[PDB]
Amino acid sequence: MDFQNFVATLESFKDLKSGISGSRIKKLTTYALDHIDIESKIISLIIDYSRLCPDSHKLGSLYIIDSIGRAYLDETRSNSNKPGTCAHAINTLGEVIQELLSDAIAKSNQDHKEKIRMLLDIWDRSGLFQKSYLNAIRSKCFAAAL
């Protein structure tokens, strides 16, 4: 599985009615861990997929970030922040996560909003995006104000 396979596999999430596949996300996640050296273009793509995907697909896009993000966060802990490290990848994601969350929440139905909230809770318990204040974004009032 090469980069072009990664791009095509990411793009195929549009052909999923739900925007979600456990096996396909695992496929992306295994690729991400095998190719940390090119994380910079893996990360930009999954960020952009979040930005651009169908409304109903935004939840899936945060699942993709959850999976790769917490996988990289584990590689970080198994022990620099230059391109081609897990630390940089997580920093890049952290710099756009509030943008991506606010939009995903605003475009999600109640069901998907609630799944984003639980995912926020898992991020909180994990230390994924700990530098970011996510507790206001997490509120039900936030979703309604959008």
Q: What is the 3-state secondary structure (H, E, C) of the chain?
A: CCHHHHHHHHHHHHHCCCCCCHHHHHHHHHHHHHCHHHHHHHHHHHHHHHHHCCHHHHHHHHHHHHHHHHHHHHHHHCCCCCCCCHHHHHHHHHHHHHHHHHHHHHHCCHHHHHHHHHHHHHHHHHCCCCCCCCCCCCCHHHHHHC
Q: First-to-last CA distance in the chain?
A: 40
Cα separation values, 46 from 16, 25, 79, Å: 16, 11, 26
Would you kindly state where each structural domain of the chain is located, as residue ranges?
1-146
CATH architecture of 1-146: Alpha Horseshoe (1.25)
The label of the residue with tokens 């490290």 reads 85
Cβ–Cβ < 8 Å for 39, 32: yes
Cβ–Cβ < 8 Å for 33, 71: yes
Give the resolution to one decimal, in Å: 2.1
Cα distance between residue 127 and residue 54, in whole Å: 28
Burial class of residue 145, CB neighbours in 10 A (0-12, 13-18, 19+): exposed
Provide the phi-psi class of 133: left if phi over 0, else alpha when psi is between -120 and 50, else beta.
beta
